[PDB]
Amino acid sequence: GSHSMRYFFTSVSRPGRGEPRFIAVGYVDDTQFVRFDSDAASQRMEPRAPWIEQEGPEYWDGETRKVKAHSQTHRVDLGTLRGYYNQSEAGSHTVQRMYGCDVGSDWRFLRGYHQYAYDGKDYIALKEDLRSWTAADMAAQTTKHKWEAAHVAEQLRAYLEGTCVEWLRRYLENGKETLQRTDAPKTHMTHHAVSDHEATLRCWALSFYPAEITLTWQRDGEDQTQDTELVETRPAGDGTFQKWAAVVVPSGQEQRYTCHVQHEGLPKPLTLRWE
């Protein structure tokens, strides 16, 4: 299918109780493979998938050096964002950065991004051309006009449209049993008596990869969303994901309903029905 690589960075100020908690995690599709925690003893960039271990020490040396750069950059942007917004040293704020690239079935470049938020709000983002910037507000304008005058989108575009794509591929070849497997959802249905007159059907997807799934309920062929309850797609912690939808139905009417399951490891959609 398509694939993506995406680095997520989280910096959190403890005003005068040390220096900001900085956390960085890299991901190929929905597999994390690297992390860095400021409060970690190692102060290294660190493997969290087997395939990446096989890379040599210069890959590890340099990744440590670069990620310590993102940290200091976050560490400064907090102090600068306090000014722009005229906030008070007596208060913990958060900055978040997210950037990566997607490749198609062919693994050619598809799209890149470079997002940035202050205190859980959109601040500045590379638009899709990767030759301009979206501001959230007037602070951003100032930042965008520093990034216009220093040619930042061009520099970014060179990473995302080049090196992101070349390394994502590399990783994809090296983790071929992990990253390039399509583990199909293993499905079943279950039944609970909620009350006298009514019952719940729950429709399960388990042990699937990647996370992207669509779990759909029908009644006589017509999509029913009213009187359902979808959970968000969660992990089992073995790099497989899970999910269920349910409906409350009238007692006896249960023959009529059907849950419908679409995932890329399923050669054709699955239907389940009660009885």
Binding site: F8, T10, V12, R21, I23, V25, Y27, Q32, R35, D37, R48, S92, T94, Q96, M98, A117, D119, G120, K121, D122, T190, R202, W204, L206, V231, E232, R234, P235, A236, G237, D238, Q242, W244
Partner: protein, 100 residues
């Protein structure tokens, strides 16, 4: 500031099976800011041997984390997640329901 309260999901890695070892998971998501306090309970007492994923976040900048521990479920025993967060007046206790 924006504040978001965790969504909580308590669930085992595998379809549970009394007398078989499994993993009890507590998936907190949709929350902000990052600081959050999560425990796995057995018959109300805290479980110590409890690890977690690394902080990461979604398309809307909200955070999400997984706490998990090994456990061998039974008919008798009872499991929950305590989650506290600045957006909560008192800590939330979602009890484990194997969804049977």
């Amino acid at each position: 500031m924006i504040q978001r309260t965790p969504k909580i999901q308590v669930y085992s890695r595998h379809p549970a099976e009394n007398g078989k070892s499994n993993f009890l998971n507590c998936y907190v998501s949709g929350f902000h800011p990052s600081d959050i306090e999560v425990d796995l309970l057995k018959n109300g007492e805290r479980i110590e041997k409890v690890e977690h994923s690394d902080l990461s976040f979604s398309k809307d900048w909200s955070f999400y984390l997984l706490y998990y521990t090994e456990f061998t479920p039974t008919e008798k025993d009872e499991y929950a997640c305590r989650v506290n967060h600045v957006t909560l007046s008192q800590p939330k206790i979602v009890k484990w329901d194997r969804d049977m």
